[PDB]
Each structure stands twice: as structure tokens, then as C-alpha cells.
Amino acid sequence: SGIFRDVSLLHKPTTQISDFHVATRFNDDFSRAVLEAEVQMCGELRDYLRVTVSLWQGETQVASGTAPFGGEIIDERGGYADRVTLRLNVENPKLWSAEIPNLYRAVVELHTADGTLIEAEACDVGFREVRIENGLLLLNGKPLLIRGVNRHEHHPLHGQVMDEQTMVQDILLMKQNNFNAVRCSHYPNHPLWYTLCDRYGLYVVDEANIETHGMVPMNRLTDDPRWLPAMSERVTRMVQRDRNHPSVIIWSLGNESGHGANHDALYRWIKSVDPSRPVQYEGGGADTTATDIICPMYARVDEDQPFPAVPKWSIKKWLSLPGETRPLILCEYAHAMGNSLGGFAKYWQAFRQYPRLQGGFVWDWVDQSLIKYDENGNPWSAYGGDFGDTPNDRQFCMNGLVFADRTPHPAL
Amino acid sequence: EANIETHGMVPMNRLTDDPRWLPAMSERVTRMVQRDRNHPSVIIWSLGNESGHGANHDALYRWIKSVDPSRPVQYEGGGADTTATDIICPMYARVDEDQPFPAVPKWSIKKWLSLPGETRPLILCEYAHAMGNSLGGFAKYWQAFRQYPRLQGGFVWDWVDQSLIKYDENGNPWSAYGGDFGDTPNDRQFCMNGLVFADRTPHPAL
Ligand code: NA
Ligand code: NA
Ligand code: NA
Ligand code: NA
């Protein structure tokens, strides 16, 4: 517990930019793109107010647009007077991907008709299209093979305080070991993480901070309408914060909370607000109506695990169950506890053989061990129960491919 | 099965893609359906064997579906998963190993079930070629059949050896195969693929 992330003061003018969304559309062969910029303002509307959106590729301006406020007619009552939608045409855009993370810079200016700048905001823009077609997850028209890993925010000395240097070290190691994707383990991450993933080229699964593993029967809260407001806040605020990051390709509704009607509601909400990213969720059997991707946890390659209500089929069998057409991406597989990762080659043979097996995220990146000191002051790595902590789960906090100080294990 | 097989054509569908041969093929299909449609034991119609894939096959598939909608229609021709079959019916597709031939690949049956857009059941029209001392790996097929709901089994090739009886100078009979009658270019012992001998004595593989 504590104030474990940054604290800051922000000063804005009374007439201000309150929100802006960016969206990219493409033609069939990705030769033509249209940058969609919707800007919302707060304060008093004046006729002299204008909004300018300019797209910069490194140092040269490639597109720009200016408009007064006032959107298109929405319904019988009219349109949004405090919103403006800018459309920019880009010829032969450079596409963003983990292999080649081409980025543009978008600058949004709120200014007067005479040319006086009031306030500016900016974001990095990546041109990429994620969609599921005919049972395959496609990025820029090509089917992805996910070489992913689950990553907690953990530092052996500072606990759950994250800093830029540790994040950069993690990204470098992951890329050097042929990972191209990361799953934010069961909560939204530090804001700089998505910027770094944009710049260095990693695909990101962004997860809402919802996990009710300890309930019996695990959906007691997520099937209760009285808890719908809190869950909705946790989902909608994450989507509002992170929707402009090109590295975020998939939304996740949480982790290990069963399956409740609240999950279906929030899945539909995300699909309505942000249709440019697929939504996944593992809870309640990994193939429910609240997921676009079959995302089992620790499903085996060839052996079935028939649990009563939530069976873990083998992934090959899972693909061909009657009526099933979705792609399969394991959200957790190859538990890396200690001396582990036996049978990894079988998973990757399966991934390469089957088109609809599009990979998975290993559990997990880094051990969650903490540093203690002996009577001589020599540090040593501690796990559950070493602090006298109330009922604990001993060494199950260390499942990483690297040590807490980022030294590789042999399984890496 | 209708009495249509053009295995020896190059390409295999040279006749079945030709409208001039449509009347003959149509006779062979429609007369069989007219003769046998009342038998309860007949559960599936088949359009023939090893004739490629031609438009004539699509036409006759639709004709059968119109006249007798109470039985599914299958056909292995070119690919085993074309538009002229209700059932994926490959020939000698293996359990776990793919066989990537250029135009008509033989995927492993498990992989075949999950190819994008594929929803049909899979029943092998021929598998476990029982030539001589054979049927190794049969248990793998049956493990697969029991594990996967959409793998609904198959037909072994085949029941009885096609050997003929000849007699020596002493008059003692002996079993003969392909080239033993002086016949024009032959395929030797490939006529004997049965689980039982020609006189219906079981082989060990049975
Ligand atoms: Na694959
Ligand atoms: Na653990
Ligand atoms: Na079966
Ligand atoms: Na034969």
C-alpha cells in the first residue's frame, strides 16, 4: 500500500482541451490512410475558437487540418457543439508493428482565428489495423504469432514502484530474447510503459484491475448488479486513459473472476466505444460470450483436463469443437516456477503447425522476490512467509524467467 | 457409390469438367439414387471415386440434394473438402503429420478440423491400408477418433484380397495376383489389400 506512483500538479486554461481520440482507417492494401481526430473542449464556446491537428513524421509535416467547433448531426436534437472531428489524408503511410515501430507525432492546437495559441497537446500515432477475420487475428492484414509474456510491476528493493530504467531494461531483455508482446498482468501499468512499448515495438494486452479469485463461487461479485458500477469504473477509465496508444492491440476485462453478466455488459461497452481492438477474457471457461479470443490458462498441447464446469481441453481439440470459429491465444502457459519450461518445444511446434493457434503469453517475466538483510547486513532474496505475513503461499511468488534483479534463468 | 472413377486421366478431372460427359455421369448417379433410395441401411450417397473435381460433380451433388434431402452426400475428389461434399472425407490422411501436396494437400485430420471457416464433420473414406503385414498405427487413429467429437471414424481399406485361383501342373490351386495371367501392364500384388484372404480366412490385422 501507499502512494506508489507519481504525484503532479497540472495547470490548464479555463477554455481547454478536455479529450481527444485518434483513429486510423485504411484501404485494402494499406496504401491510403485517413487519420481520424475527434477533439472535445471544456469552458465557454466562442465563435473565434479553432482546432488545428497536424501530423509530423520526425521533422516534416505530412498532413494538417483546421476547423471550428461543432460536430455532425447526431440525433433529433442536433450535434455536439463542443466537439470537432478532423480528417487527415496520409499517402503511403509507414505502418506500425513490433518489427518496425514507425511513429508519427500528432499535435492538437486550440487557438483563436487570429492565430493565438491557447493550449496544445500531443501524442504518438502509429498506423496499424487489428482485426479478427475468418478466425485469425490479423495485424495490418497479416496473421500474428504472439511470442508473449506476462509481466508484473515488481522491483526487489522498491516493491511495486516502477521507474524508467527498470522498464527499459525489461523491454531490452524481452526483445533480445525474441518476445514481441507483453500482457500487463491483471492491472493497468505505469503510463510511461505504453510509450516505451510504442517506441521499441511490443504488442500490449491492457487489462482492467479486476480479479476476484478468492470468492466462492468466484463470480459472486461479477454476477451481482450492485458491483456493476465499480467494475464499470475500472474498465471504462482504463479505456479512456489508454485508447490512443498504438502498442495496445487487445483489451482484457480482468483475470480469474468467473463469468458474470457484468462481464458481458462491459464487453459490449468496449465493443461500442472502441471497435478498433478485440476484447478478451479468460474467466468462466475461456470461451464465453465475453471474449473474442479463446484464451485458456495452462491448457496442454495434447492432453485434456476435464474439470466439471470449466474443462481445460487440449488446445488442438479446443480449436475444432462444434461451432467454434475464434482464434486461440493462451493468456498463460508454461509456468516458469524454478527449474521449469519442460515441454515448451511442443507448444511451439503446435503454434507453427496450426493457423488458428496464434501463440501465447508465458507465465511469467520476473520473480516477485524481496530483499531482506541478515545480522551481518548481507542481502538475501525472500519469498512468502519470510516477513511473518498472515497466511501465505511460500515460494509461489517466484515464477519468472529472470531473477528479481533481472539476471536470466536458464529457461530463458 | 456411383460407378464413376477416372483415375487414369491427366489431369484427373479432364472428363468430369467437360459438359459433353455430363449426360453419362448424370445417368450413373440418378439411376443409382432411383434404384436404392428406399433402403434404410443406405445412410450416405457418394458421387464416385478419384475423378478430380469438376463442375459436373457440383451439378450432381445439387441434384441429389434436391431429389433426396434425407441423406448427406460425400465425395473425396480433389481436396476432399470441396463444395460437392457434406463431409470432409480424405483418403489416407495421417493422424498428426501433414502431407503438403501442391494442389490437394493431405492435412493431418486434427489440423484439418480447425482450418479457418471449416465446420463439417470428418470421416475418412479410406485409411489404414491393409496390404500384407500392415495396420501399424491403427490405435493412434482410434485414440484420435474417441478424443475428437468431429472425427467420426472411417472406412478401412479394405475387406478382402483380390487374389484369383490358378492351378499348377499337378492341379494344386494357388493364389495369383497382378501379372500372373500375362496381362497387359499390371500392378503386381497391389490387388491384395484385405483384412481377410480371398477365401475369407482372417489375417492377423483383423
Ligand atoms: Na499458428
Ligand atoms: Na504465482
Ligand atoms: Na469422434
Ligand atoms: Na490396391
Cα distances (Å, whole numbers) of residue A322 to A248, A305, B34, B153: 31, 18, 34, 16
Helix (H) or strand (E) holding A146: strand A146-151
SS3 B89: coil
Q: Which residue of chain A comes nearest to B120, CA vs CA?
A: A322
Torsion of CA A342, A345, A350, A356, to 10 degrees: 90
Closest approach of B1 to chain A, Cα-based (Å): 28
Annotated ligand binding at A256? The verdict is: yes
Q: How many helices (H) and strands (E) does chain A have?
A: 6, 21
User: CB neighbours of B9 closer than 8 A, spacing ≥ 6?
Assistant: B15, B51, B52
A300 C-alpha vs ligand 1 centroid, how far in Å? 15
- Give the whole-angstrom CA distance, residue B164 versus residue B193: 13
Pick B111's closest partner by Cβ from A136, A325, A354: A354
List, in sequence order, every residue forming a beta bridge with A330; answer none if it has no partner: A360
| Contacts with A354 from chain B: Cβ below 8 Å | 111, 114
Pick B148's closest partner by Cβ from A135, A320, A354: A320
Annotated ligand binding at B39? The verdict is: no
Which residue reads 524454478 in cell numbers?
A: A338
CB contact at 8 A, A160 and A171: no
Q: Shortest CA distance to A45 belongs to which of A65, A68, A66, A67?
A: A68
- Give the whole-angstrom CA distance, residue A359 versus residue A98: 15
Radius of gyration of chain B (CA): 19
| Contacts with B150 from chain A: Cβ below 8 Å | 320-322
B132 C-alpha vs ligand 4 centroid, how far in Å? 11
The verdict on a CB contact (< 8 Å) between B115 and A325 is: no
- Give the whole-angstrom CA distance, residue B45 versus residue A405: 67
Cα distances (Å, whole numbers) of residue A255 to A22, A207, A212: 28, 8, 8
Which of A317, A321, A356, A357 to mutate against chain B (most B CBs within 10 Å)? A317
Cα distances (Å, whole numbers) of residue A378 to A49, A371, A374: 64, 10, 6
User: CB neighbours of A101 closer than 8 A, spacing ≥ 6?
Assistant: A126, A198, A199, A200, A201
In degrees and rounded to multiples of 5, residue A11 shows phi and psi of: -110, 130
What Å resolution does this PDB entry report?
Answer: 2.1
Helix axes B55-67, B22-36, angle to 10 degrees: 30
User: CB neighbours of A34 closer than 8 A, spacing ≥ 6?
Assistant: A24, A25, A26, A87, A88, A89, A90
SS3 B15: coil
CA A202 vs. chain centroid, Å, equals 11
Question: In this complex, is the C-beta atom of B117 within 8 Å of any C-beta atom belonging to chain A?
Answer: yes
- Give the whole-angstrom CA distance, residue A276 versus residue B90: 39
Residue type, A209: N
User: CB neighbours of A112 closer than 8 A, spacing ≥ 6?
Assistant: A48, A49, A50, A118
- Give the whole-angstrom CA distance, residue A379 versus residue A91: 57
Cell of A200: 521499441
Q: Shortest CA distance to A94 belongs to which of A119, A118, A60?
A: A60
User: CB neighbours of B147 closer than 8 A, spacing ≥ 6?
Assistant: A304, A317
CB contact at 8 A, A207 and A184: yes
List, in sequence order, every residue forming a beta bridge with A16; answer none if it has no partner: A42
A404 C-alpha vs ligand 2 centroid, how far in Å? 14
SS3 A332: strand
CB contact at 8 A, A234 and A207: no
- Give the whole-angstrom CA distance, residue B107 versus residue A51: 57
Radius of gyration of chain A (CA): 23
Which residue reads 500375362 in cell numbers?
A: B182
Which residues of A are tagged catalytic?
256, 332
- Give the whole-angstrom CA distance, residue B55 versus residue B49: 15
- Provide the experimental method for this PDB entry: cryo-EM
Q: Shortest CA distance to A296 belongs to which of A274, A273, A313?
A: A313
**Within a 10 A sphere around the Cβ of A189, how many other Cβ atoms?**
21
- Give the whole-angstrom CA distance, residue A408 versus residue B10: 59
User: CB neighbours of A176 closer than 8 A, spacing ≥ 6?
Assistant: none
Question: In this complex, is the C-beta atom of B147 within 8 Å of any C-beta atom belonging to chain A?
Answer: yes
- Give the whole-angstrom CA distance, residue B58 versus residue B16: 10
User: Which alpha helices (DSSP H) does A177-245 contain, by range?
Assistant: 191-200, 228-242
- Give the whole-angstrom CA distance, residue A407 versus residue A217: 39
Residue type, A66: T
- Give the whole-angstrom CA distance, residue A338 versus residue B187: 60
CB contact at 8 A, A131 and A138: yes
